[PDB]
């Protein structure tokens, strides 16, 4: 994930922005300068482009079974090919247990040394989400979510929320609620020989507050806010025992009225980070934490569209496949004694980067939301080749299996090799949006129709619409040729001229429309075919980006006529008559970014924290690390090729 | 058998599905994409296929004693063969323990006329089926179970059910009755040496509740549901005694009516599995457990037939040979000690795998059911000469041996090495299915004669019909040549064209018809006989599989006249006419299954889990492992050789 | 550990100091000469430095059972691992002693469910602390013990004490109470074979009074003084039995009140040590005794801080993991016979050394305390990058493992191979000290704000402060480069001079400031921040050590502006100004400690004794010695490698 965020060490460094939101949303401001090269002279314009991101969401969880992983075991027990040496783990118990006779191995295999279902990624989800919520809490920004009330005088949209924004809590209370629901049974089991088949976790190097936090968050999660991360989650395990030298019972007392909320307020974000770092470093959970970060980032937030038709993508809900929690590392103290067993290098470097800066996960999530939303429309277009490909040889099979859905979308949008989940049966997916013809309905209020194909008072949207500017992944290089996405392009003459002298293919017509809307001239396009009532290219005043109209996507018509270019009231840099001969000049448009920052409303400016590849140096002290990986465990990167996109290892 | 289930998926993504039932049935949805590449114009079509299954069955059980197996004792008590070194036992009694010479001499004189009959296969059968029933009950769907009600709108067929679901129980009742049926005369044994030739059990490592469950489940088992694994079975031993530290009294009060039902509930599935694990790994019953697992898998369930005529497969009832219960492990306490001798490697690894994941047995049962049906059907088909040039004596070659019946069926189906029972005189058989003229009078209530072989108010079939489709096991190489059963097939030019259309061979015509029905074209055909009421390639929806046309089941029909190729009501991919010599093209297809997730009924969806075989190495400590097998015991595999399927060693 | 204490003085003049206390504290005077050689003009100054210590502490003890160690029995009763050859035990019972076959068979049947948990570490802990307390009492200075009352004339700080000295006892009272607390149910055992799984002790070689002391000291131990080694501890075993020739009755009358206090006095220190020696060398408990000695040393005492902020180090309380008491040596009389097996060489030599001189433990405790504090502080410092070019992950590298916590601290401090505990799941830890932001609210009563980080009426610290000075262990090579911690350092030219003075690096400035404060010049400095109330290099008298200036604890500060070099009130050696480029000279210093003699308070002076290691060879007769160690048991050493400190074998 770190390599993708840093765009392969571009300028040797990268950047990230802190998590922050107001009423469940936050703008993402920018400043850009767009040049103009014609008449062997330069014009330019500077304009502040914004972008709206919302944290609201209602994903659906599935705490199903998942494959067990034993990577954080000593080298002497695990093997690259032999794996778990059951004889080696068993006979070590005999040398240390007080159980007599030769039936020691039989009893141990009967009771506890048969399951081998070590997997804590659900717990890592819980704790990392808790850290993010606590950040939003003490930053004075924790509240119920609220999708913005989109309004332009024309058709307007409003989506409902589970809980009221004002009725939402102003402080982060506990996930579970005391004296309402059951809690898992826990007890410090420090015996050398396990007695009952039950998940075991080693939290010896954790302080009392950290172990209290972990064992309390072990219980059921209850949603109290509309945020996409407050998803419902039951208690991960019905029963478990924690390997701690000291006995901790503050949570147990708080179950009864013994401890009030005052004396059991949730801890601080640095306390959560210390607990998580201690836990991961102790149990050698680098790959599992990397997978946890991937999963949480993929559900962090969605980009609020600036167009009326964009809300169709926003209204959707995702499905998460979190494996059932199971922990077998406290069953035997000697398991952790020794170097870690084949920890993935990408996981290690990513873990070190997150420890250096805990904001990398949020910045990656912010990038990935925009990247996925763009990549869905991008693959829908690229499958048909603007309706100019006969067969279906684009080979979009990487979008079929729900595991690689998001990663394939990322590899489609940007040429960067999207990072694999590093696990199996775990994913976030919108199955209804699998095929490129994704019809959907939008609930719509009562406004007068102005060429917006309103059907049954419900905006009918086909597929997925591009709903966010690419300004945070600007070098996207989505199309093969030059475009606003690439950043620098040159407007060319019309293909031919006729009685209104405007013959342009959809792609360069959209290029010219975006250039003119940047320059302050709205453009009128007219095709006598299917139009649905749009005569000018759709754009937003706050965000000068011009969304590609549907007729470019449908691939039926290949030409669009731009009859007259009108001048907006908010005039800007003057241009000649482009849509006429003997006056058009080969203008070229380039843009660069001036200032990028993330602000919640207009208050408490959050200066960006620079991150470079200097601290990327992993801690290799007693951690057997392998850079290579296997596709079986989904350790690779989906890469876009000439014919399409496929999954390959990084080599 | 783990090797078989892994090679079914060629060691890539070895899927397995949780047990789940809805009224005794369920359905396994898939998502398979089929290609159509011709003239470098690659097309494809994805579609969901649902091959449903039913757990309802009424097998016939014959409890006949067979060979006595003693391959779990220490080496020093066993000779070079299975012969028990009884003289060694008495010498060890003389040497190790200090017993009066008169006492040991009297015991040795008494033992000279004792039966060393030890077979716990029936006990393992009962315990495993009880565990599965408890799993199904705690899942909340256990009931009497009913055969599916299938109708095509032209014929309505409903097989009678012995016990209806409405009157069926909802909670798992005990196999026996409350003092209504006599219980076995169990007793407590704790001395060093046996006193009566009655078999004795070693159940010391088990807990009080597990011993209660085993002892009272030893009683006569009554069939209370139409479940296939709910076969009737008598008390496995009229008298016995368990070697335990203390006597167990809880079950006796319930037996005699002192304890009511609520005071004695059925134990959990987890504790049942723990008891089974303890018993097997304590008596070292790995081989007998492997045989019992094979029997359960082969007797688990049958596939619901999509077509009408396939219900004949549901009509037939299996016959089994369960050896009588015998136990000499509890006769002496030293026998189970030492290093276990004569343990098969395949049995050990299979036992480790099934205890690591208790769903391997169920997925192997599903695979064996579908493979059995396909193997029998394609055996009948290849008897004609369809697809196979060599007219091998498939009728009576190796299908006579009941122990090798199902394994030979699997060999004929897939070509993979079917795992043998590993035990003598134990098998599952359908005696009325060896003949190739097996007809059945399936009761029908015809709505209208859509065209079938309906005779005497209830139609008949020939041999074995088709009930399933090769989708749980797709890459099955039933035929040597390319076919839909294989991954991909290349449609070739017609043998001869003519004015009305073209004629086709036995296999090529069916292959093209299946490809066209997948594409969306319904294919008509004309045959020299008039033996049916429809000139169509029947292909029921839900799986889009075109059954082998019944006309080719008989011989002397090598050419089939195919005409009238046209689109159906719905259409997926445009294809050339393929019958006229002008429009014909060398269409090549390719099929691959991507996703599969069984779901019980219409609410409970059970996502496909996964198995990490790297972590499931067997517990090889303290075990004398033997890779080789003995053909008289049927410790081997059967492979479909080009010269005829036969039993071979794994070497 | 003897190797460690000898290498601290590089095997030359291995000093050691008698235990001595004054109100729970004492002070270790020294006489160290510091050189100043420049331009062949060698100067020097001798001065007495006093680094005082306190024995007062309140550690937290968690009595949790851990791994069972059996490495003291004869070879024939032990397998290749720690597994007890119980079958060998029963065969030897059969062969050697003439016991009825029925009796031995019954005993063998009973023994099958017995716990071979044997760990006498808690017992050795208790006996050693009792011996030390009796030594301190007979020395005539035992009391409740009070924390020192330190004030600089500007802030008055006094840590609260649980038990004041005035009400504190003057004579060593018994750990238990006169029938107020229940005593363990001891008994007399003399038969050949055990009868109950309750642990049994072999105390035959001990005398009647020693057995009385051990048996009644087995009871619950109450904390009656604020001594660090006076931790509360419950009864180590509710029931037990001692293998002795005759029963012991003297203690019982005192237990039941029949015997009054004067009739039963605490036994002498000499007889306590004799009893400990007999017990250890009879049960062959060398490894467990070495572990217990390590624990006592690591938990003995803390250094009184000269500076005000160092009292935060005294605020923190340790946490320990003492394994539960277990004894199987007394189960059978033959076990202790034969040749002892699995005895570590280091443990044997350390045991011989500590019994030759019972002060080695105390001097090693003092050294481990000072090394611990210095290691933690310089770890926090080197996290910034002070002195060390490589920014190794010192935060969480190997400090997570509690068993390796203090050893890693010692490795970071000195670079010498720290001796491991030699036992699993036993450690001393400060959980609130792993984090680098550990703050404490030390209660202060400010007389006047002389300039400190005083906030909220009670100042705070960051991480771990400094309380001691590297004078008990002078040649400590904490930093790779030359420094005051090393023997000598060469002051080099300034990086850049300027009109007001010169600027200096992070390390060179502190080195020069320390050298100048030793010389007699007070050095001022200016920093880009304003984070303190004094621009001075703080150096309290009594030790003439200049603490690391707190400004450099944080990062992003590489250059420090130093000016105003001038003589203090008193002066020792004339030095050039060293800041102006003209007066600057290449001053080179050299430091060496000559004399040291701890003295308790102001009256009792304990001259430094000596140890002749030539006469302290271990008793290797009748012992199977093993030089190698097993990393799971933590039988090794940790060395500060250039690539990061880690656990290595001694080979």
Author numbering:
A (entry chain B), B (entry chain A), C (entry chain A): 1 to 651
Publication passage describing the model:
S. cerevisiae, a genetically well-described system, harbors in its genome an endogenous virus known as L-A virus, a member of the Totivirus family, and its discovery was the main starting point of research on yeast virology.
To isolate complexes of similar molecular weight within the native cell extract, we performed size exclusion chromatography (SEC) and reproducibly collected the resulting fractions in less than 8 h from harvesting yeast cells (“Methods”). In the acquired cryo-EM micrographs, large unperturbed complexes are visible, including fatty acid synthase (FAS)44 and polysomes as well as prominent circular signatures. To first explore this signature, we collected 7011 movies at a pixel size of 1.57 Å and performed image analysis of the derived spherical signatures, resulting in an icosahedrally averaged cryo-EM map at 3.77 Å resolution (FSC = 0.143) in which an initial backbone trace could be built. Mass spectrometry (MS)-based protein identification of the fractionated cell extract verified the abundance of the L-A helper virus (Gag, Gag/Pol), and also the presence of the L-BC virus, albeit with lower abundance, after adding these endogenous protein sequences to the available yeast proteome (UP000002311)22.
